[PDB]
Amino acid sequence: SHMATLKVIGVGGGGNNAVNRMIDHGMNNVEFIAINTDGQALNLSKAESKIQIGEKLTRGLGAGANPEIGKKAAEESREQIEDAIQGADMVFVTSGMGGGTGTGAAPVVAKIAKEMGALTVGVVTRPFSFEGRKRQTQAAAGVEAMKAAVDTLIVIPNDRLLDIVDKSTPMMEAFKEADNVLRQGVQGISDLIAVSGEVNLDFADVKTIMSNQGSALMGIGVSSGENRAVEAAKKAISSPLLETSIVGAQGVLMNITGGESLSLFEAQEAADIVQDAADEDVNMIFGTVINPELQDEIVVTVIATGF
Ligand SMILES: Nc1nc2c(ncn2[C@@H]2O[C@H](COP(=O)(O)OP(=O)(O)CP(=O)(O)O)[C@@H](O)[C@H]2O)c(=O)[nH]1
Ligand SMILES: [Mn+2]
Numbered sequence: 345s346h347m348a349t350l351k352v353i354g355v356g357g358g359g360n361n362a363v364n365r366m367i368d369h370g371m372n373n374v375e376f377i378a379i380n381t382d383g384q385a386l387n388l389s390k391a392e393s394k395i396q397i398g399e400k401l402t403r404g405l406g407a408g409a410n411p412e413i414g415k416k417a418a419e420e421s422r423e424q425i426e427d428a429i430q431g432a433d434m435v436f437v438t439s440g441m442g443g444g445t446g447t448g449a450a451p452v453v454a455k456i457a458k459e460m461g462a463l464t465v466g467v468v469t470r471p472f473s474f475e476g477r478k479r480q481t482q483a484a485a486g487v488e489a490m491k492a493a494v495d496t497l498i499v500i501p502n503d504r505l506l507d508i509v510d511k512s513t514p515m516m517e518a519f520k521e522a523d524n525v526l527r528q529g530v531q532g533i534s535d536l537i538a539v540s541g542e543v544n545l546d547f548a549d550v551k552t553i554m555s556n557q558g559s560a561l562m563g564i565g566v567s568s569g570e571n572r573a574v575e576a577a578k579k580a581i582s583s584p585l586l587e588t589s590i591v592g593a594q595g596v597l598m599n600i601t602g603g604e605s606l607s608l609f610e611a612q613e614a615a616d617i618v619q620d621a622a623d624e625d626v627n628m629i630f631g632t633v634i635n636p637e638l639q640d641e642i643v644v645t646v647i648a649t650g651f
Contacts, residue, residue, distance in 0.1 A: 364390050463555065466498065563646045
């Protein structure tokens with residue numbers, strides 16, 4: 345029997361903010377690593393494993409928007425990064441693009457993870473338009489470098505946060521909504537790995553859907569009542585925060601979890617929703633889990649690739 349090790353690695357300020365908020369919210373069986381040039385921020389990290397990179401280059405400060413310094417910092421700490429990753433079967437690298445440490449170091453961290461044998465997923469933000477064109481261009485180069493280094497990449501443009509707030513929503517509450525993309529994806533995969541299903545999916549199926557694929561979508565939806573399966577499936581695939589929507593997906597892993605009432609008909613309905621929304625002939629990997637503790641709730645987990 346296989347026991348997959350999942351790790352989440354925050355790189356730079358926004359990545360380490362996401363790690364801190366995920367640890368606060370509560371996650372289990374997931375190991376966290378914080379990587380930064382900024383020593384003061386690392387002192388505030390809740391991560392069990394902390395790597396300060398680039399101290400000779402930055403004297404414990406951030407990289408000051410210089411991605412070449414963030415890249416050199418990570419490269420010069422390769423052995424320390426390898427040691428922290430060793431043993432991971434899957435690594436999620438999260439970082440905010442546009443600055444120096446995230447833009448420059450995150451693609452190096454991802455390359456090291458993949459070289460170490462981990463299935464490597466990047467979840468990164470693009471800067472708000474109000475941060476200006478140069479930051480957006482620098483972030484775009486980081487995204488391209490990430491894409492070349494990971495198995496799959498999920499990009500969250502921060503401008504989409506402006507579509508989900510009202511005029512008073514606290515900035516921190518908006519940031520938590522972006523964190524949910526990563527957190528719910530990690531949780532969904534962790535649950536798929538650990539919980540035996542009646543139509544069982546495991547980590548090998550995650551590897552098949554994700555390995556060397558490029559852009560990806562990861563989503564969870566939960567609903568109850570009439571039309572629950574369709575409603576949960578639509579929620580799983582319809583996040584307003586994503587650069588890569590479901591449209592165009594050629595491969596999908598879909599798991600449905602429900603109670604003993606889970607019907608064959610509604611499983612087909614959920615699968616058809618995903619395929620219809622992809623508007624492609626999708627190569628599906630389908631799973632089902634019966635959790636009797638659940639009563640009327642249904643949970644649909646989707647990972648889509650092949651764009
Ligand atoms: N959604 C979200 N975006 C963030 C968050 N923190 C920063 N950002 C965004 O990430 C981008 C990079 O910020 P940051 O992670 O602090 O960069 P850095 O590379 O570590 C800083 P330096 O350039 O000094 O090394 C910012 O321009 C902003 O768009 C966060 O917590 N949540
Ligand atoms: Mn800085």
